[PDB]
């Protein structure tokens, strides 16, 4: 597969993109509250996508019909946004990707709706430690298994288990381009990280097993085989001569 190595005035784009990504993702959160619905919160990030002079990358993506993906609970990733009302104790995953100038910035966070039990908590915090621990092993000359790896290890040894069949993924002036960023791995194998390389890290987190189920039904919606809670967050960094960079800060 070709690898793509980008210039700084790519970079400078990307910032921006990542940057409108983040503002989307602190914007929303006061609004995040018990009796709400995940298409109040797909209209109000639409609304502040489009009025930033920059597009909703999800809408219409191979079909999908909303601006943002919204996953409650035991759902893993890209529940699609909904009329059921969020409940006190939720914890919700909401995933942005806007298109600003033509350059994609992919972000997402967990949110608290109302007050979140300790359990929750846990999973919660390990999982955005278990993607820190990924992208801090980002530099020229680390190999791609690395990142798998140091997620695998940290996510494991903390007793949660690690979502294997959906990744990150190199992104720039298209959504999703090569390489896979898989979330799971063996140390020191696979392709040699370049200066110049822009991806995201995702990794999803079960407080259960590790399998998964993608609902046949609306063709989207990933939930745990075992209703066990999931986690999840993600962010879109370049590769630089001293190590990462995060755009979506
Ligand atoms: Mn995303
Ligand atoms: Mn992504
Ligand atoms: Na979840």
Redesign the pocket.
Same mark, same amino acid.
């Given at each position: 597969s070709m690898i793509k190595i980008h210039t700084e005035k790519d970079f400078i784009k990307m910032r921006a993109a990542g940057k409108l990504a983040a503002e989307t993702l602190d914007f929303i959160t006061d609004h995040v509250k018990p009796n709400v619905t995940t298409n109040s919160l797909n209209d109000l990030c639409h609304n502040f996508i489009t009025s930033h002079n920059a597009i909703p990358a999800p809408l219409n993506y191979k079909g999908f019909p909303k601006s943002i993906?919204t996953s409650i609970n035991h759902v893993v990733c890209h529940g699609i946004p909904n009329d059921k009302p969020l409940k006190n104790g939720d914890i919700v995953n909401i +995933?942005? /990707?806007v298109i600003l100038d033509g350059w994609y910035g +992919? /972000?997402?966070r967990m949110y608290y709706v109302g007050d979140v039990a300790i359990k929750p908590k846990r999973l919660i915090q390990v999982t955005y430690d278990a993607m820190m621990k990924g992208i801090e092993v980002v530099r020229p000359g680390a190999k791609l298994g690395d990142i798998g790896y140091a997620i695998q290890s940290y996510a494991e040894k903390h007793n949660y288990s690690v979502v294997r069949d959906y990744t990150g993924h190199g992104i720039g002036r298209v959504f999703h381009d090569k390489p896979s960023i898989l979330n799971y791995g063996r140390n020191g194998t696979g392709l040699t990280l370049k200066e110049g390389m822009f991806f /995201?890290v $995702?990794p999803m987190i079960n407080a259960g097993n590790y399998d998964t189920i993608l609902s046949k039904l609306d063709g989207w919606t990933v939930t745990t085989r075992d209703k066990s809670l999931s986690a999840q967050f $993600?962010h879109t960094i370049g590769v630089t001569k001293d190590g990462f960079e995060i755009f979506t800060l």
């Open positions: 993906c +995933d942005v /990707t +992919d /972000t997402s /995201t $995702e $993600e």
